[PDB]
């Protein structure tokens, strides 16, 4: 009934945390790259 929605949430926050933490360790190289192409 609502335990299904309970772990709907729980794994929704799980996925959000997973993607945010996975991305947070991959920022410096992306910033340097983007600055590299945008600057001629």
């Amino acid at each position: 009934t609502e335990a299904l929605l309970a772990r709907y949430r729980e794994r929704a926050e799980a996925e959000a945390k997973a993607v945010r933490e996975k991305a947070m360790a991959r920022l410096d190289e992306a910033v340097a790259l983007v600055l590299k192409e945008v600057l001629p």
Binding site: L4, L5, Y8, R9, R11, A12, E13, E15, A16, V19, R20, K22, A23, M24, R26, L27, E29, A30, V31, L33, V34, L35, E37, V38, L39, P40
Partner: protein, 128 residues
């Protein structure tokens, strides 16, 4: 039985969008802090040369009041009347010969022009 995966997917997408907008804000930070570093003259010279070569016959090279030293000699030798303007931060503004056309060449213009092309490689380097 189905709303759960919809909310999960939308949360994933909005988290990715938040990370991407944070990346864009970091890029803006990196761009607007350039002039203090002495690499500013090289950037302004690149922008001036590309603007002048993209605009044949340019009569004027509009610039910033504080950007005269790095571009005055080039503007003089090109045979144009350069003038200052508080606007056009981080770039230069070429003017057409007829005076009815111009090309504005701030860095932010290039950045938000090419952001849509950036997005693919930004995504596949951030998570690929």
């Amino acid at each position: 039985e189905s709303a759960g995966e919809l909310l999960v997917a939308t949360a994933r997408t909005q988290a990715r969008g938040e990370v991407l907008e944070e990346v864009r804000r970091r890029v803006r930070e990196a761009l607007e802090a350039l002039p203090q570093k002495p690499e500013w003259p090289e950037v302004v010279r690149k922008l001036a040369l590309e603007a002048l070569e993209a605009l044949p016959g340019a009569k004027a090279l509009v610039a910033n009041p504080e950007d005269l030293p790095h571009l005055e000699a080039l503007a003089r030798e090109r045979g144009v009347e350069l003038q200052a303007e508080p606007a056009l931060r981080l770039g230069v503004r070429a003017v057409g010969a007829e005076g009815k056309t111009q090309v504005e060449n701030s860095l932010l213009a290039r950045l938000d022009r090419a952001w849509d092309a950036l997005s693919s490689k930004v995504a596949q380097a951030l998570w690929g």
